Design a protein around this ligand. Sequence first.
Ligand SMILES: NC(=O)C1=CN([C@@H]2O[C@H](COP(=O)(O)OP(=O)(O)OC[C@H]3O[C@@H](n4cnc5c(N)ncnc54)[C@H](OP(=O)(O)O)[C@@H]3O)[C@@H](O)[C@H]2O)C=CC1
Ligand SMILES: NC(=O)C1=CN([C@@H]2O[C@H](COP(=O)(O)OP(=O)(O)OC[C@H]3O[C@@H](n4cnc5c(N)ncnc54)[C@H](OP(=O)(O)O)[C@@H]3O)[C@@H](O)[C@H]2O)C=CC1
Ligand SMILES: NC(=O)C1=CN([C@@H]2O[C@H](COP(=O)(O)OP(=O)(O)OC[C@H]3O[C@@H](n4cnc5c(N)ncnc54)[C@H](OP(=O)(O)O)[C@@H]3O)[C@@H](O)[C@H]2O)C=CC1
Ligand SMILES: NC(=O)C1=CN([C@@H]2O[C@H](COP(=O)(O)OP(=O)(O)OC[C@H]3O[C@@H](n4cnc5c(N)ncnc54)[C@H](OP(=O)(O)O)[C@@H]3O)[C@@H](O)[C@H]2O)C=CC1
Ligand SMILES: O=C(O)CCC(=O)C(=O)O
Ligand SMILES: O=C(O)CCC(=O)C(=O)O
Ligand SMILES: O=C(O)CCC(=O)C(=O)O
Ligand SMILES: O=C(O)CCC(=O)C(=O)O
Lengths: 456, 452, 455, 448
Amino acid sequence: MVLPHEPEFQQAYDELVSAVEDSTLFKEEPQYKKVIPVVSIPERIIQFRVTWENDKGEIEVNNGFRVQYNSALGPYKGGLRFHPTVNLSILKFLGFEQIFKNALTGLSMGGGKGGSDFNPKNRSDNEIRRFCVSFMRQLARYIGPDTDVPAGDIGVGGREVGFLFGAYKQMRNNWAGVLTGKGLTWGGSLIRPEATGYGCVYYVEKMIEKATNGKETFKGKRVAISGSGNVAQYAALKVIELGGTVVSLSDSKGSIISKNGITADQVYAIAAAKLKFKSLEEIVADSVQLFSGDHSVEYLAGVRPWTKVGQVDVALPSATQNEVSGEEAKALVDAGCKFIAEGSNMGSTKEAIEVFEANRDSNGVWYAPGKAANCGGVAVSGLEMAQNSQRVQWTNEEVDAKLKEIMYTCFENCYKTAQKYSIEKNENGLPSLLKGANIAGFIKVADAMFDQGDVF
Amino acid sequence: SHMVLPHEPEFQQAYDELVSAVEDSTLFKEEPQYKKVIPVVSIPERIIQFRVTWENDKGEIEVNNGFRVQYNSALGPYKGGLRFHPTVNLSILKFLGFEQIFKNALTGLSMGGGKGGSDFNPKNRSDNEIRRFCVSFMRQLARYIGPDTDVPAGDIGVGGREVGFLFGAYKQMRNNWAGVLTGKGLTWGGSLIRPEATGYGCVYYVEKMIEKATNGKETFKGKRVAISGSGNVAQYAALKVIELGGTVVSLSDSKGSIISKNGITADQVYAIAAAKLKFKSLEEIVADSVQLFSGDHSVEYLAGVRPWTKVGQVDVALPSATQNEVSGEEAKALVDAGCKFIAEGSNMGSTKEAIEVFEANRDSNGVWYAPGKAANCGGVAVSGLEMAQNSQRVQWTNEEVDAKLKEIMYTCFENCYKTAQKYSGLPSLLKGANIAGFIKVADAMFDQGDVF
Amino acid sequence: VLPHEPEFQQAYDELVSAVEDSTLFKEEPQYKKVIPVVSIPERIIQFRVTWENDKGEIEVNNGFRVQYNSALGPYKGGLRFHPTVNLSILKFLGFEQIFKNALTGLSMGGGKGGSDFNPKNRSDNEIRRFCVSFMRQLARYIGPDTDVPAGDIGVGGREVGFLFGAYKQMRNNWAGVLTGKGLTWGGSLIRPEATGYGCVYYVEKMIEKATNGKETFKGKRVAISGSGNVAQYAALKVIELGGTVVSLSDSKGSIISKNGITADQVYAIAAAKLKFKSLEEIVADSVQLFSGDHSVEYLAGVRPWTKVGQVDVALPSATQNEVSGEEAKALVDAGCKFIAEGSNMGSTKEAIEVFEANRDSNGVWYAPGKAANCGGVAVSGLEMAQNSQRVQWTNEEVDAKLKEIMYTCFENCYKTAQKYSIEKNENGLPSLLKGANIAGFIKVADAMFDQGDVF
Amino acid sequence: LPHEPEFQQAYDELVSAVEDSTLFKEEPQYKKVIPVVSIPERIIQFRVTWENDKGEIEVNNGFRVQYNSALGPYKGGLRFHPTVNLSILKFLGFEQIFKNALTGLSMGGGKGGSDFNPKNRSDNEIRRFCVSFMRQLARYIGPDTDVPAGDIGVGGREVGFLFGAYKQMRNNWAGVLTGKGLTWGGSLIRPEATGYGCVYYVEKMIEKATNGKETFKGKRVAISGSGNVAQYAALKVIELGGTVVSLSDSKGSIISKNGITADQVYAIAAAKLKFKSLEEIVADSVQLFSGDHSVEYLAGVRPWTKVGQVDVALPSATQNEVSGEEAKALVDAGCKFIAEGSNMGSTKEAIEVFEANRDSNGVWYAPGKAANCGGVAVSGLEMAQNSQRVQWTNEEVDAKLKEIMYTCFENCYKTAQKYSILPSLLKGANIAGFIKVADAMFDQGDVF
Ligand SMILES: NC(=O)C1=CN([C@@H]2O[C@H](COP(=O)(O)OP(=O)(O)OC[C@H]3O[C@@H](n4cnc5c(N)ncnc54)[C@H](OP(=O)(O)O)[C@@H]3O)[C@@H](O)[C@H]2O)C=CC1
Ligand SMILES: NC(=O)C1=CN([C@@H]2O[C@H](COP(=O)(O)OP(=O)(O)OC[C@H]3O[C@@H](n4cnc5c(N)ncnc54)[C@H](OP(=O)(O)O)[C@@H]3O)[C@@H](O)[C@H]2O)C=CC1
Ligand SMILES: NC(=O)C1=CN([C@@H]2O[C@H](COP(=O)(O)OP(=O)(O)OC[C@H]3O[C@@H](n4cnc5c(N)ncnc54)[C@H](OP(=O)(O)O)[C@@H]3O)[C@@H](O)[C@H]2O)C=CC1
Ligand SMILES: NC(=O)C1=CN([C@@H]2O[C@H](COP(=O)(O)OP(=O)(O)OC[C@H]3O[C@@H](n4cnc5c(N)ncnc54)[C@H](OP(=O)(O)O)[C@@H]3O)[C@@H](O)[C@H]2O)C=CC1
Ligand SMILES: O=C(O)CCC(=O)C(=O)O
Ligand SMILES: O=C(O)CCC(=O)C(=O)O
Ligand SMILES: O=C(O)CCC(=O)C(=O)O
Ligand SMILES: O=C(O)CCC(=O)C(=O)O
């Protein structure tokens, strides 16, 4: 009646809260009970009209948001999303996620997220540029390299980051790390494109190693991936590089499934075309030869790939929120899936997580939440901030190694934390990475909040 | 693409009222360019939400949500009050700021549209808790306001005490002394008619309404006036009605109404004001002052009831409490009781149904409704006069501010009347106010490139 | 351990004892909470001021700005360039300024600043370099809505001009950041005369109330100390009103006459003091003006109070602690019935004790500086109003506003002293000291409570 | 000028160290510097209004002295103690200028604090005060302007409350303060920094004085105070094989002969966090301070005279905590090495005694601005980590601290020798810092 209905935010909130209460944490230190109703209310939200001009010279209006959620661990850090579904609820769920994700990267980065209900698809680069300019001119006053460092997300990539950076510099007359994901010649980092997907696959590497005592790797594993964006493209490429077989990709209109695995050239063509806002249907149509040989793929319109891949070992939802239903989760378990890790933010529904966790101690089915598995993107963003602040640019190998080490440490932190605060430690079984990640992030943020007087 | 925007019923009510007043006129046909403005002006230029953390008297941590909606800055810096009330959310404050744009436009002063507040509840709370909350609030807010950017003021739950605490917090954070807020204390930049402003202005507007409706043959002399609420607006509306020879037949608050038949007296309003400063109920106020409410000026307290149906024959109604406090049925009850003049002291005091009833009785039973964005604009007008006094480094006399308020209210009535007639018995002041304010704001937005 | 600050403690004790010896804390005890808050300045700024003299050598001085209280408005106060300047003196001055400004009825906070830099007998080039250095250290912390300084001892129109230029060069803004500005770049017309004219207007109202309009300044002997802006224009107003100015003084000696100092003598003193001349040197340089029927006796190293015989009015207009208890007794014995400070805290506690002890018996009426000399800051506030309105008022308009401000101040002192007196003598003069202190304190304290500065 | 005895003490010490040398004769331009550098660039005093747990209004004085910024942004701690006044903070900031100069880092001089007393006060009252203080102060500091830190009465808890207040007012997350928590931008050796650095400096002192024939091995070391400086100086002395014969606090001293143990220091630290006296801590943990490692508590007395034969003395408590009589008592007790963990720990009389016995009895005195510069050095290393957006390992920071302290020792020795007439480490440190700061002031046009 008073508070507005914000279901996605409430979903993320409930996931974290139920992970924290279902543990020994409040018993061992009840002071943490004070923290939940404070950290969950954002330090600041900024909504603004974004007025711009389309190619016909008509006036267009969209809503722009920047949610600066938590700054205990550092300046606000988070991506920007341009998608017609964007509202305060979605951005609140994303920023709440981001707080504890950033806590898991071990770098000094606060939580935030922003975007607009602007729809960039099938739009000219001129219209995108005008909207980014107007948007950043509305936002510039409230961000800065020590205050709030946005980046990309759905609908926001290198092109959009470039337009935004230029607009910011024209308004504020500063050249600094006000954004991450910048171009390599004007302050970018080398592994930032690959970061999220590579990090997800590294995290699943460590998962597999722990689950099989080093007896299995990504070697010969069937991997079902959703989405076809930055996360999905580079997760697929790393799975291919590590000897797995990528059996699926998807987008907003359908899925593509193969049985022998998607090839790297196919991912490259998909990436190039997705830059041009092509559907997977249109790309399998445009490159008939490339998607028809021994590496042919079947395009299934209107369907998510989880049920359409048969036996599968690993599942990497890498598209959007709530893209794995309870039904799809049960189907994955029945199809032999033993590793599910979100490259997307809150990719799994509450029901999917219930299924995965209920199959954990019995079928060895191991689920890792996005705030742990996909934190490589913000991790390498923070590394870009480090390079910018140091006025240096690191090599490919240096950033990749730091990314690998950050992902592995995050896995170990999830595992050991889940063990430390488990109510009944079922030995010969796998501890909850969900609970582990949520509790580790919460403890770090809450300790810092106490220290700084944000809670008492 | 579906159901993205959050549910904001109060904002949509204000929006629909203004839009339907603008569409049902010759305005879009005579100049269709105005059609471009509705979807731009209706999206606020800027909104700021912030956590307000404070400490209660036990040393416990309390958390509330704070908002400042800076809606439109075409005609001047953002101008609007602050509301501390447990119902506060983005929707209510958006409706209030959207209203405020065109209200401020009707005052003829250079004032943009805005509004703010928090779901903090000050009722029965110590002045220490109020002070701590105001400090935390203003510390989160100051960075975004200024005497040339955004000049907040009071509203429900925010009066002189809260404005003072907020001003102190602002001065400590920003190290400047200026008209960053209106409704300030007289010794540190306030104006003399600002407390009285809203109710006095409502009564002045209804003065001009009655004069036009009766060709100067009737005044407030001997009129039965039903007022709701017992706050700043209602108190001073009642006092002005008394001074003008009317009989105030009712007041109310969140728990019940009080009704009289000889009229409420000025001493009764003074006692109610003093007691409401300490968060007393009207029930408790008639209990605590038995002598004052029992003679020929006795009052009956009706718990849980609004005064509209409980007053018998009534000539004028001044809802001066909150939004949506006059139902369609209560509007019919007023019409049946002979009510011919209705002017909102509160913001959006009438439901859409009540406005439909009054307008449907306009040409036939001569029932004349005036919306809040016209009638209660005296408060923000005298706020702007406070801003002018601050900018000039002067303080005006009682009569100077009272006269400027009077002329602004009368000019507002004349503008509503002429505009209602120009784009169409008694003309609809609802349409008049909405269209006049809309035209002024939209011309300024066109001139400044906010719309093209 | 608190540092020794005698001048500040003097002003503090004066105000505190005026408020305690009244019905005030009985009528509203909440005010007791305000004394230990308001008496600690909101902010103090100390800074090194490095400059270059005419030989091209580096000189170093201390610069201060004490921003004491901002409840009633932005910090308002003058700047003093004098070698005795330290934090203690400026704290007393800014503390004074709080309640003085409160009495002017304008929106003005309390503050004061300056430097131990000594401008006497120094070239205009050295003064310009020092003003530039000083204002560049200070500008970051002042502004037309934050802190509006002006002149004082050692700082006049020339120094205000250099300061305004340096500020405009650093901050790139043209606004009322200072008062006492030149007429062509944002100044006001009565500001030079303001303090002395207002002091004499206050004594006008004093005489009127004390004698039921039967006496005026007509035919009164008036002893003035000092020879600066306050003293010059107080003397000119006394002359214009038909009185006889029997003395002036400076840091080296006094000048005494028996027919009264003339306006032309005052003009010459002003012109020569602009060039840092002593009274000895000015009576030597203009022998023609100081030798006829208007001859003058120069007494080196002496204050004029004991050296004038019978005198009716005394206007100390030079510096702090310039009337000792002995000089107060001498003035009482010489028949003085009106004493009003043109300088800030001109009288020692002993002198005030003498005057107050003779109030109800000999009708001897003392008015403190925070009431009597508030005309200067009042017209400075009017300069701020003119700048804010982008208008400049006529001579007569500002002079009239000054007169009404001074009269309002006297009436407030009188009525406030009577309202809260525990002397309760039907007959007798009420304490203007207590009146001014209590009225100013009440206004400032109410504002502090409203704004949450005290709770 | 107002009476400022502590500032004048520090000023006179530095000036007499510089004048009693060949410096002004070799290059007389330095004569212009003393009356400039000794006047602080800027001082900010402000009322700090706060609210106690009873809801009553409390008022205190807050100061920030930004003394000299030639070598970098102002760097200095914050002291909450009822004795705080402008004189004390001026003495500390004047010291800090040349201390920072000796650390070889880009750090100006400054110091601040309040007469607020944190003793026996609830964490809520401390948080409210820190909030009021930092909200009054933030406008004048910044990661490139003035980076405060802790001192007496201000530790990790207070640094946390202050950092929160600053971030809430200025909306920036950066290295505006040092001594921050490890999880929000802190450094790994910062707690240990000052005492560890003092002990490393005395390592090099002993080494130079005996040509490497002696170390801290088997030496009697008398420590005063029981705060951060004293705690970690004691821990480093223990780790290096010395015997800690004493500690002290504001109420009395504790003395033993078998050496203070690490567990005892840990308990003292935990209890001092709750504002317990040494009397109360030896009472509350009788087992830990009465067994084979028992300790004798002498109330109201400084430990220097109550420890018998002693080799090293580390005053680690406050200013003017070693009198001339106590200096003679230490010399007679066989002390040959004295290094101040506190700022201006020794009185003029104690320093005169030590220097007068230097060339004859080989007693070596090192001033605090050289010996205790490890704390501000690791503060600067925290600043470097923040600016780089990195956090270093324990070993990395410990090694950088060690090398900085050793470099400072060599600079003291070499500079004392270059301009003299065992060399005086006092004059060495003072002259090295003065030369660096003065050259920088000349270059930037602060002196001409
Ligand atoms: N980019 C980064 O660095 C980071 C991204 N993430 C998370 O990964 C997920 C995707 O990121 P990213 O690769 O950058 O996004 P992209 O814009 O690169 O692509 C997103 C993919 O998801 C699909 N998709 C988008 N919207 C919907 C929808 N409403 N319903 C169904 N499918 C949809 C898109 O299909 P189509 O192309 O047809 O529109 C596209 O295939 C998000 O949850 C994001 O927050 C997490 C960490 C960092
Ligand atoms: N103050 C001003 O200058 C201006 C005010 N207004 C409008 O006037 C109306 C009230 O103004 P104001 O006098 O300042 O407010 P006040 O706080 O002084 O009092 C408001 C009155 O309305 C009653 N009331 C408040 N909320 C509710 C509710 N949710 N349900 C039922 N009754 C309620 C209150 O009852 P109770 O005392 O029991 O809480 C109180 O009597 C608002 O619509 C405001 O926006 C318009 C122009 C300017
Ligand atoms: N100027 C203004 O607008 C205001 C001034 N006042 C107060 O009035 C007094 C003087 O003001 P103003 O006329 O403008 O100042 P000026 O600089 O114009 O002159 C001050 C006069 O007092 C003499 N004098 C100054 N200091 C001392 C001293 N320490 N000991 C002895 N004699 C001294 C000077 O003598 P000489 O120069 O010949 O050596 C000079 O004649 C001060 O107390 C000031 O605070 C109050 C209100 C406003
Ligand atoms: N902290 C740092 O990094 C650095 C510190 N220093 C200097 O070291 C000294 C202490 O620092 P720190 O350890 O952090 O402070 P702490 O507040 O942690 O403790 C200081 C110790 O000295 C005692 N003490 C404090 N004041 C007095 C006094 N007036 N008279 C006698 N004994 C007293 C205290 O006793 P009790 O607890 O009972 O009050 C406590 O045992 C200061 O002079 C400081 O300037 C120098 C370089 C850096
Ligand atoms: O790079 C960042 O700022 C965060 C990346 C991102 O979009 C996320 O973690 O959700
Ligand atoms: O600005 C003011 O005077 C209060 C504004 C307000 O709430 C109104 O006019 O309805
Ligand atoms: O003009 C001002 O700002 C103050 C004038 C002055 O010198 C004083 O009142 O002390
Ligand atoms: O460590 C710091 O940064 C402040 C300096 C200090 O406390 C000291 O060395 O005395």
